[PDB]
Amino acid sequence: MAKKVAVLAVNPVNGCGLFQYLEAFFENGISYKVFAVSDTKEIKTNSGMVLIVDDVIANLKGHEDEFDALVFSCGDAVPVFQQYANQPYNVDLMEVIKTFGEKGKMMIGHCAGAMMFDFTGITKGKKVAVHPLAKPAIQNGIATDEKSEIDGNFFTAQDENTIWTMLPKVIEALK
Amino acid sequence: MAKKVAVLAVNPVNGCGLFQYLEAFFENGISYKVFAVSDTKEIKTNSGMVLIVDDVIANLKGHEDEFDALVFSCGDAVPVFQQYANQPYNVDLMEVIKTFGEKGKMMIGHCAGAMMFDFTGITKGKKVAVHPLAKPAIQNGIATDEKSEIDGNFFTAQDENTIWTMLPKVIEALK
Ligand SMILES: Cc1cc2nc3c(=O)[nH]c(=O)nc-3n(C[C@H](O)[C@H](O)[C@H](O)CO)c2cc1C
Ligand SMILES: [Zn+2]
């Protein structure tokens, strides 16, 4: 019955968005493990702070059944995602997202998180919140202009500044 | 003429509160440096994340005139402050807050940040916003129950959840 959350942090990752999830989980006693979307668990933030997380994204593949939810913390790695699309960690990212979406896991994200989910196709026929610049990239999903969208098991926010509009409902759904 | 900000992060520090400042500073081209209120450059967050900042608080002394603002990021280190009040890094904390207060630098903080400010007497006759649990610990200052208090050069918030009520003003003050 005990839930488990897999948190995905890109490199670099928006620290404000990330530690809104993590500090909320810790204070509510929600278990979580943070995975780096890179070849090392030592990442940076957009602000420049060096951050050493729990593990890498490669060690998440095959362990999707051990978690009940997935969190995509957006960052400045996304505006250059297309350049590094063929990077090992960026390939593992789409695979992890795809598997979690098929298991029916709780999909959580913000900013460009909806687009990364939509690149797979798990957001088909689902209301999602996404950054105004990543909105025309939403093909399978149904992008809205709302600060946050909760449809089925998809919990998305427009950016890191509108996470507060959905975070309590995310918390009460986990523990 | 370039406004430089000195950010003080405790150990452990509330990650959500800290990166609300740093990411906001980054997106607005505000120069800042993060000093660890601990023995070493490497600290952790309340969530458990290993965080490596810029420098230690000891290397801030004598260089307070090289900054225009002082930020106090509260954390779980404060409820254990009375036990470690005689620690070298906690002694340096009170001495750098004093120095920044003498030159009339922009004093920023949240949660129990106003309490640490009031422990020096810099907040005399000044309205401050502080955590409800730390409110009776305000003798020199004028503690309120408001989310944020801006009085003169003091910019305090009730906790990490009410930083957004004063942060736009902080950014404008730092350009
Ligand atoms: C932790 C956190 C809590 C917030 N809470 C609120 C809130 O209660 N009401 C609100 O209108 N905006 C809230 N915001 C967003 C905030 O109003 C906005 O991002 C800017 O401060 C003003 O545009 C919050 C943002 C963060 C990061
Ligand atoms: Zn983003």
Ligand SMILES: [Zn+2]
């Ligand atoms: Zn605190």
